[PDB]
UniProtKB/Swiss-Prot annotation, chains B, D:
It comes from Hemiselmis andersenii. Belongs to the phycobiliprotein family. The keyword 4Fe-4S does not apply. GO terms for biological process: photosynthesis. It comes from the Eukaryota. (2R,3E)-phycoerythrobilin 1 binds at residue 16. Keywords: Bile pigment, Chloroplast, Chromophore, Electron transport, Membrane, Photosynthesis, Plastid, Thylakoid, Transport. This is Phycoerythrin beta subunit. 15,16-dihydrobiliverdin binds at residues 48, 52, 59, 127, 146-147. Its main location: plastid. Heterotetramer of 2 different alpha chains and 2 identical beta chains which form 2 alpha-beta heterodimers within the heterotetramer. The two alpha-beta heterodimers are rotated to an open configuration in contrast to the closed configuration found in other cryptophyte species due to the insertion of a single amino acid, 'Asp-65', in a conserved region of the alpha chain. In the open form, the central chromophores are not in physical contact but are separated by a water-filled channel. It is a peripheral membrane protein. Contains three phycoerythrobilin chromophores and one 15,16-dihydrobiliverdin chromophore with binding of the phycoerythrobilin chromophores mediated by both the alpha and beta subunits. The light-harvesting system in Cryptophytes contains phycobiliprotein complexes. Unusually they are composed of either phycoerythrin (CPE) or phycocyanin (CPC) but never allophycocyanin (APC), with only one type of biliprotein being present in any one species. Unlike cyanobacteria or red algae these proteins are not arranged into higher-order phycobilisome complexes, and they are found in the thylakoid lumen.
Length: 72, 175, 72, 175
């Protein structure tokens, strides 16, 4: 059921075939898919973290800029 | 499978698949490479997609930010932006995995009833969802006008239709 | 001198006068100064953190979208 | 003050100012409230400001991303975006503190020589800096067409001129 836990699957897709690698987190790094990795974590979607008020800044923006269209 | 276990584990600690494990994983879903690019098109633009969608809900119905509107205070606006992101992330996982079972079970089952209990307006939710659907289809198909994505030349129409169906499951559950 | 360690002053200006408060890190969130705070740290400007490739994503965007004008 | 000691401390760990201490901080600089709003305009929009500036450099000279180009690889483009952010952040601290001593000492002293040794081109830096200056001034003066700031109506012209002078110090040091 929807558990009211605000948890959601965070999927991150990495393509580092340019050669600038991030932290090693998976053991398979050789062959055709060298440089490619997918991560999934199941965690709370928080308003902010690490001192960074991510969603609060987005909220401030809506109130003042909802009349703007960032898609064009 | 590695990822299914993340959904059900006690702490949701991240799992990672690369190289030969990822090659194997892509064999179990259709159009594996384009599918990864389509998922990336969602998650790498999560803030943009949520912002534009909630902003369009408000611009079409500014009473939502009038006193006693659904998103009048920053606290409520942020909760709404959060929920839109939660939904979007469950949709992204549905596209990664090729089905909607986790979305249905852990995001949608009980959600309409919770929103009724809270007084969260269904019309506003429907519009945030329909804009998120349109925005995601735009990014997947590289028809986003301010932010294109680099991918090998081709056609992602089938994956766009698939993701649209997952958004349609959200809409139908919350109507 | 410039130390070649990429450390810069991170200034964060908080205005939470809407009433939704973040974590308390100083006295004074009361009276005429309700909701206002300034933070400064001196730390490396990293390419990413916490698994989020912040500057790598910005670089990908430039390669494809340098012909777009996000200011209009 | 306490923020000066953060700059010079061995570990740079954060310090915070609120309440009466924030009232005192604002007295010792001119136009304290508008100044805090101006610093906020810079740091809250740091990704946008840096992105538009470096993107402007590239669109005025697309050879920079072709093979044999100075930001051709992702690694180099990211180093350039990082450097633009470092400079912007030293400028933000100059506007917070009311002077440019830390910018000149810890960011600019030695930087022209370092870029010469690395082959970081002065003309590209000049354009990135000039766009960043114009962008920051635009944000501070209600000339940001895709992002309005919430501030009481009024005249931030002096603060825009001040921050312009800090950018001019960067330009002159790196020319
Ligand atoms: C971060 C946003 C973004 C970037 C960057 C980009 O390149 N594309 C982006 C978003 C995007 N939006 C849509 C479609 C819609 N967006 C809205 C909301 C805005 N329209 C308004 O009238 C309004 C208030 C002033 C907004 C805010 C709407 C309503 C839609 C269409 C919904 C529908 O039923 O059709 C897309 C899809 C592709 C396109 O450009 O049309 C994208 C990619
Ligand atoms: C995140 C960017 C942004 C938002 C959001 C907003 O509301 N304003 C924003 C940016 C902004 N940019 C400028 C000025 C300039 N930006 C550029 C680069 C773009 N022009 C291009 O030709 C190019 C590639 C094709 C770009 C990328 C340039 C060149 C300028 C002008 C600099 C100058 O010498 O004057 C501003 C300042 C206000 C303005 O509109 O000029 C702002 C706020
Ligand atoms: C309510 C849930 C809001 C929301 C607020 C957030 N603020 C966050 C970070 C933050 N806020 C302050 C200012 C506050 N603390 C003080 O001590 C004083 C005055 C003395 C004030 C005015 C600070 C200093 C911080 C950073 C904390 C730090 O340095 O670690 C924040 C991020 C929380 C976190 O990172 O853990 C949030 C979510 N955000 C929202 O979306 C709603 C509207
Ligand atoms: C719709 C989404 C796009 C479109 C996508 C295409 N991608 C194609 C090939 C491709 N993409 C990747 C990267 C991808 N695979 C992964 O495992 C991960 C990260 C974990 C990512 C980000 C790869 C490796 C490939 C194979 C070829 C290559 O190396 O470049 C592709 C070509 C057809 C196909 O391979 O099925 C397409 C069409 N292209 C578009 O034009 C729309 C907008
Ligand atoms: C080089 C400096 C680049 C850049 C790279 C970054 N990548 C970041 C995070 C990241 N990258 C991967 C994929 C990589 N790890 C693997 O094990 C494999 C395959 C087996 C690959 C292809 C992952 C999994 C991660 C997340 C790490 C995590 O979950 O903690 C990253 C953020 C670093 C961090 O969060 O500490 C960066 C900066 N960024 C750039 O700007 C240049 C171009
Ligand atoms: C140019 C930068 C803008 C402009 C800004 C104005 N701000 C004015 C007054 C004001 N701003 C704040 C918030 C500020 N002070 C803090 O301590 C902090 C956080 C630590 C911040 C974010 C306050 C508290 C005030 C006093 C008024 C109030 O109580 O809201 C202002 C009025 C003139 C003045 O007080 O000097 C202006 C013009 N306005 C513009 O049109 C440009 C775009
Ligand atoms: C945005 C398009 C909406 C809007 C959304 C609001 N949701 C509010 C609170 C809320 N949302 C949920 C569901 C969320 N939690 C989960 O665990 C999951 C899925 C796993 C989801 C999608 C819950 C359980 C809650 C209540 C508990 C909480 O706040 O975390 C909310 C605040 C309501 C209030 O406090 O009165 C809002 C504003 N509101 C709108 O008007 C638009 C249509
Ligand atoms: C962007 C507008 C430029 C551009 C910038 C590049 N800088 C590169 C390496 C680099 N930058 C610095 C200065 C930086 N480190 C600091 O500690 C401080 C201030 C406290 C700053 C401003 C250093 C010391 C270095 C080398 C060490 C490092 O990488 O951290 C760089 C990579 C060059 C290379 O590796 O060959 C670039 C691309 N490049 C351009 O084309 C435009 C004009």
């Amino acid at each position: 059921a929807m558990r009211k836990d605000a948890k959601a699957p965070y999927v991150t897709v990495f393509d580092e075939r340019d050669g600038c690698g991030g932290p090693t987190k998976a053991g398979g790094n050789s062959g055709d898919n060298k440089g490619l990795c997918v991560k999934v974590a199941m965690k709370k979607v928080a308003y902010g973290e690490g001192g960074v008020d991510r969603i609060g800044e987005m909220a401030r923006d809506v109130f003042v800029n909802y009349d703007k269209q960032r898609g064009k | 499978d590695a990822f299914s276990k993340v959904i059900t584990s006690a702490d949701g600690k991240a799992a990672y698949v690369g190289g030969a494990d990822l090659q194997a994983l892509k064999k179990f879903v259709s159009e594996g490479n384009k599918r990864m690019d389509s998922v990336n098109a969602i998650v790498s633009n999560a803030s943009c997609i949520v912002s534009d969608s909630v902003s369009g809900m408000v611009c079409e119905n500014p009473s939502l930010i009038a006193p006693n509107g659904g998103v009048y205070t920053n606290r409520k606006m942020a909760a709404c932006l959060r929920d839109a992101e939660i939904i979007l992330r469950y949709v992204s996982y549905s596209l990664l995995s090729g089905d909607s079972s986790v979305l249905e079970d852990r995001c949608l089952n009980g959600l309409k009833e919770t929103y009724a209990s809270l007084g969260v307006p269904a019309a506003g939710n429907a519009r945030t969802i329909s804009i998120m659907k349109a925005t995601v289809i735009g990014f997947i198909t590289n028809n986003s006008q301010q932010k294109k994505l680099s991918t090998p030349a081709g056609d992602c129409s089938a994956l766009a239709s698939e993701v649209g169906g997952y958004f349609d499951k959200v809409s139908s559950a919350l109507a």
